[PDB]
Design an enzyme around this catalytic site. Structure first.
Site, mmCIF file in Angstrom:
data_model
loop_
_atom_site.group_PDB
_atom_site.id
_atom_site.type_symbol
_atom_site.label_atom_id
_atom_site.label_comp_id
_atom_site.label_asym_id
_atom_site.label_seq_id
_atom_site.Cartn_x
_atom_site.Cartn_y
_atom_site.Cartn_z
ATOM 1 N NE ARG A 157 5.183 -13.267 -25.677
ATOM 2 C CZ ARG A 157 5.153 -11.943 -25.590
ATOM 3 N NH1 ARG A 157 4.009 -11.288 -25.736
ATOM 4 N NH2 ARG A 157 6.276 -11.277 -25.357
ATOM 5 C CB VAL B 106 -12.337 -14.186 -30.516
ATOM 6 C CG1 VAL B 106 -12.412 -13.986 -32.004
ATOM 7 C CG2 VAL B 106 -12.501 -15.658 -30.168
ATOM 8 C CE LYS C 71 -10.475 -7.472 -4.577
ATOM 9 N NZ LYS C 71 -11.222 -6.545 -3.670
ATOM 10 C CE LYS D 135 -4.066 2.197 2.023
ATOM 11 N NZ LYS D 135 -3.459 3.544 1.814
ATOM 12 C CB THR E 71 -13.183 -10.772 -24.407
ATOM 13 O OG1 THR E 71 -12.496 -11.353 -23.295
ATOM 14 C CG2 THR E 71 -14.580 -10.378 -23.989
ATOM 15 C CG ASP F 252 1.502 -6.827 -32.245
ATOM 16 O OD1 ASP F 252 2.513 -6.397 -31.660
ATOM 17 O OD2 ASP F 252 0.471 -6.161 -32.378
ATOM 18 C CG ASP G 32 3.298 -3.032 -32.625
ATOM 19 O OD1 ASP G 32 2.110 -3.161 -32.977
ATOM 20 O OD2 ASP G 32 3.763 -3.512 -31.585
HETATM 21 N N1 LIG Z 1 -3.816 1.985 -24.422
HETATM 22 C C1 LIG Z 1 -2.673 2.612 -25.028
HETATM 23 N N2 LIG Z 1 -2.357 3.911 -24.762
HETATM 24 C C2 LIG Z 1 -1.219 4.490 -25.315
HETATM 25 N N3 LIG Z 1 -0.372 3.743 -26.149
HETATM 26 C C3 LIG Z 1 -0.694 2.451 -26.406
HETATM 27 C C4 LIG Z 1 -1.842 1.863 -25.849
HETATM 28 N N4 LIG Z 1 -1.914 0.526 -26.275
HETATM 29 C C5 LIG Z 1 -0.835 0.280 -27.079
HETATM 30 N N5 LIG Z 1 -0.096 1.499 -27.181
HETATM 31 C C6 LIG Z 1 1.195 1.603 -27.799
HETATM 32 C C7 LIG Z 1 2.525 1.395 -27.091
HETATM 33 C C8 LIG Z 1 2.853 0.027 -27.511
HETATM 34 O O1 LIG Z 1 4.065 -0.524 -27.144
HETATM 35 C C9 LIG Z 1 2.454 0.004 -28.979
HETATM 36 C C10 LIG Z 1 2.092 -1.320 -29.561
HETATM 37 O O2 LIG Z 1 0.932 -1.809 -28.962
HETATM 38 P P1 LIG Z 1 0.712 -3.352 -28.731
HETATM 39 O O3 LIG Z 1 -0.763 -3.541 -28.622
HETATM 40 O O4 LIG Z 1 1.229 -4.121 -29.966
HETATM 41 C C11 LIG Z 1 1.516 -3.873 -27.152
HETATM 42 F F1 LIG Z 1 1.175 -2.931 -26.254
HETATM 43 F F2 LIG Z 1 1.018 -5.053 -26.774
HETATM 44 P P2 LIG Z 1 3.348 -4.102 -27.194
HETATM 45 O O5 LIG Z 1 3.962 -3.065 -26.241
HETATM 46 O O6 LIG Z 1 3.965 -3.941 -28.538
HETATM 47 O O7 LIG Z 1 3.685 -5.535 -26.645
HETATM 48 P P3 LIG Z 1 3.420 -6.830 -27.488
HETATM 49 O O8 LIG Z 1 2.570 -6.468 -28.666
HETATM 50 O O9 LIG Z 1 2.619 -7.869 -26.652
HETATM 51 O O10 LIG Z 1 4.775 -7.476 -27.914
HETATM 52 O O11 LIG Z 1 1.484 1.118 -29.175
HETATM 53 MG MG LIG Z 2 0.241 -4.073 -32.112
HETATM 54 MG MG LIG Z 3 3.191 -4.955 -30.178
HETATM 55 NA NA NA Z 4 -11.187 -9.679 -28.105
HETATM 56 NA NA NA Z 5 -0.686 3.613 -2.286
#
Ligand SMILES: Nc1ncnc2c1ncn2[C@H]1C[C@H](O)[C@@H](COP(=O)(O)C(F)(F)P(=O)(O)OP(=O)(O)O)O1
Ligand SMILES: [Mg+2]
Ligand SMILES: [Mg+2]
Ligand code: NA
Ligand code: NA
Ligand SMILES: [Cl-]
Ligand SMILES: [Cl-]
Ligand SMILES: [Cl-]
Ligand SMILES: [Cl-]
Length: 326
Positions: A140, A94, A63, A51, A92, A181, A183
Site C-alpha cells: 500500500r 500479477v 453461507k 438478507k 492472476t 496506486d 490516479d
Molecule cells: N469497474 C469500474 N467501474 C467504474 N469506475 C471504476 C471501475 N474501476 C475503477 N473505477 C474508477 C473509480 C476509482 O476510484 C478510480 C481509480 O481506480 P482504481 O483501480 O485505482 C481503485 F478503484 F482501486 P481506487 O478507488 O483508486 O482505490 P485504490 O487504487 O486501491 O487506492 O477509477
Molecule cells: Mg488506478
Molecule cells: Mg487508485
Molecule cells: Na492480474
Molecule cells: Na436482500
DNA sequence: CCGACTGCGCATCAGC
DNA sequence: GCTGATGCGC
DNA sequence: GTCGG
C-alpha cells in the site's frame, strides 16, 4: 470491520468466481453483497438479518449462517485445497495476467513465481512489468507518500505548461490514509469535447515525468490514458521506495465534473450510482450524463457545472468524496 | 419466471 | 491495413 | 447470485 469475517468471505468468493469460474455476474454480485454488508452499522447475528440488505439473497444468507456457526465456509475450504484454483488465483495476482491467461499458463505448466521468472519470453509487455514489480505492487501507499508524489506530479505538470490542471483522485481524493496506486486526472484548455487543438498533450506530461525519473515503466499508453509505474526519489543512503502503479487520464476540460466524478470512485460507488441513474432514465460515464430515451438510445449530454449537478439529475443527495468509499 | 446486471481505454487477436 | 471481438484493468 | 416487474 464489524463484519470483517463475512465480507472477507464474500470477497474471496467474488475472486474465485472471476478468476477461476470466469463468471463475471457472480463476481459482481458477491462484490455488491460484500459492499452493502461492509457499510451495515451492526454486527450481523444471522443470515436472515443480512438478507434484509439489497444484494444479499438466499444463497449468500445461507453461507452467512454457515460462517456464523462454524467460523468458516466448506465451499471455500475445498477451493483453497484445489491445486488448480490455487494456481490460477495466484497467477492472476500479477498485473496483466487475467483469468484467461492464468488458466492457460497452468495448462502449460507455468504456475509459480519461479515458473514465471524463467518463462519471461512467454509474457507480454504488461505481464513482464507486473512480474518485475510483483512484490511492490502488493504494498500500500501511505498517504504521506501520496502527498509527496502529488507534489512532484503537480509541479512537473506545471513546468510543461502552466495551463494544465492535475487532480489526484481515487481513494486519495476520498481521504484514504493509504492508497493502492495513484490516479491522476489531467485537463488542458486545448482539449475539449469540441476540439483537440494540441496533440501530444498526454505524451508531453508522460515524457516530462520520465525525464525526471518519476515514471519508470509503461504498461499501456494511448492519447488519453497512460498506465505505468512510478517511484519517489530517496535521499543519500536511504533505502529506495517501492515502485508504484500510476494511472493518468486526460479528460476534455469541459467534462471535468463527470471525469473527476468517475475517477474519484469508488468503483462500487460508481456502479451503484450508474445503476441508479439508469433507474432514473439517465446514463452516466466519465464524460457526460445523458437521458435515456423511451427507445433506450442515450440522448444529448445535459449541462453540468459541478459534481453535485450530476447527483441532482438522478435525485440523489450530494455525497462528499470521503463518503463514496463503497 | 427471466432478462439484465456501469461504462470504457488500450493491447492483442482473428478474419478479411 | 481495417474493423470487431475479447482480455485486462481503470 | 440477486432482483424487479
Ligand atoms: N469497474 C469500474 N467501474 C467504474 N469506475 C471504476 C471501475 N474501476 C475503477 N473505477 C474508477 C473509480 C476509482 O476510484 C478510480 C481509480 O481506480 P482504481 O483501480 O485505482 C481503485 F478503484 F482501486 P481506487 O478507488 O483508486 O482505490 P485504490 O487504487 O486501491 O487506492 O477509477
Ligand atoms: Mg488506478
Ligand atoms: Mg487508485
Ligand atoms: Na492480474
Ligand atoms: Na436482500
Ligand atoms: Cl456469471
Ligand atoms: Cl472460510
Ligand atoms: Cl462535466
Ligand atoms: Cl459521452
Amino acid at each position: 470491520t464489524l463484519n470483517g469475517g463475512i465480507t472477507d468471505m464474500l470477497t474471496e468468493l467474488a475472486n474465485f468466481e472471476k478468476n477461476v469460474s470466469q463468471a463475471i455476474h457472480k463476481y459482481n454480485a458477491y462484490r455488491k453483497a460484500a459492499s452493502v454488508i461492509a457499510k451495515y452499522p451492526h454486527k450481523i447475528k444471522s443470515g436472515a438479518e443480512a438478507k434484509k440488505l439489497p444484494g444479499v439473497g438466499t444463497k449468500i444468507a445461507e453461507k452467512i449462517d454457515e460462517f456464523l456457526a462454524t467460523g468458516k465456509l466448506r465451499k471455500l475450504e475445498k477451493i483453497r485445497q484445489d491445486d488448480t484454483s490455487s494456481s490460477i488465483n495466484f497467477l492472476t495476482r500479477v498485473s496483466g495476467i487475467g483469468p484467461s491467461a492464468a488458466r492457460k499458463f497452468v495448462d502449460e505448466g507455468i504456475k509459480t513465481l519461479e515458473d514465471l521468472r524463467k518463462n519471461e519470453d512467454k509474457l507480454n509487455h504488461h505481464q513482464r512489468i507486473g512480474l518485475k514489480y510483483f512484490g511492490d505492487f502488493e504494498k500500500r501507499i501511505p498517504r504521506e507518500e501520496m502527498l509527496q508524489m502529488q507534489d512532484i506530479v503537480l509541479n512537473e505538470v506545471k513546468k510543461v505548461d502552466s495551463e494544465y490542471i492535475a487532480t489526484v483522485c481515487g481513494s486519495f481524493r476520498r481521504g484514504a490514509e493509504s492508497s493502492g496506486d495513484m490516479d491522476v486526472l489531467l485537463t488542458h484548455p486545448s482539449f475539449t469535447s469540441e476540439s483537440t487543438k494540441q496533440p501530444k498533450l498526454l505524451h508531453q506530461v508522460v515524457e516530462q515525468l520520465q525525464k525526471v525519473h518519476f515514471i519508470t515503466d509503461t504498461l499501456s499508453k494511448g492519447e488519453t490514458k497512460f498506465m505505468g509505474v512510478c517511484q519517489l526519489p530517496s535521499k543519500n543512503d536511504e533505502k529506495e521506495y517501492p515502485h508504484r502503479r500510476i494511472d493518468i487520464r486526460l479528460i476534455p476540460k469541459d467534462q471535468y465534473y463527470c471525469g473527476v466524478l468517475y475517477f474519484t470512485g469508488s468503483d462500487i460507488f460508481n456502479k451503484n450510482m450508474r445503476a441508479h441513474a439508469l433507474e432514473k432514465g439517465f446514463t452516466i460515464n466519465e464524460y457526460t450524463i445523458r437521458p435515456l430515451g423511451v427507445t433506450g438510445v442515450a440522448g444529448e449530454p445535459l449541462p453540468v457545472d459541478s459534481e453535485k449537478d450530476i447527483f441532482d439529475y438522478i435525485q440523489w443527495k450530494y455525497r462528499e468524496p470521503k463518503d463514496r468509499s463503497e
